[PDB]
Amino acid sequence: TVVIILVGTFTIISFFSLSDVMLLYRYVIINDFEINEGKYFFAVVIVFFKIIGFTIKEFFKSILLLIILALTTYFFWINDRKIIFSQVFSSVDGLYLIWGRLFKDIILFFLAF
Amino acid sequence: LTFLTLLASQAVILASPVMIVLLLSEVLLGVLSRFAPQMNAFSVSLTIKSLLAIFIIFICSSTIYFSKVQFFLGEHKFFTNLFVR
């Protein structure tokens, strides 16, 4: 009954935007300059990394977990096929949003089924 | 100077279904390994990645033909818009 520990993924869902924003910030500034202190940039990298980071009875239960995972995978693939095959037509900039939406949708779809 | 980014953008756009399917598959396998502590997940991940990738490529063999005509038009107008005409 300790199956529901999936709230961690929902909590760390903000890492999507955090990583995007911070990594592209640093890449953009480096490409704007190509001349820096050489250590201020390293300290900035460290700070941004830190801010982003912040008998055989049991076999039956294991097979229950495996069949739960297979069932939820099949159900999600059935219910979320057109979204992927339409993201084939997606513009490059908006692809990350669809990626995050699909990931969040499947992680909510799991819910111990 | 936009040729390289155009190429990369088109590649990522076309390969997006396979990319996302395989990424989600390995995330799910990682969850399984989280609930199955003493297990080698790398070989299983490789096997399922291969099978899922080839299956997705097979079922995706209906979105390739018109991309050639789209590239016809896009490359024609692109090479038109390169010189000071």
Partner: peptide, 17 residues
Amino acid sequence: FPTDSLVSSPRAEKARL
């Protein structure tokens, strides 16, 4: 053809129109 089709195809859309 259905409305919430499994996966779009050019012939499906052309028949839809």
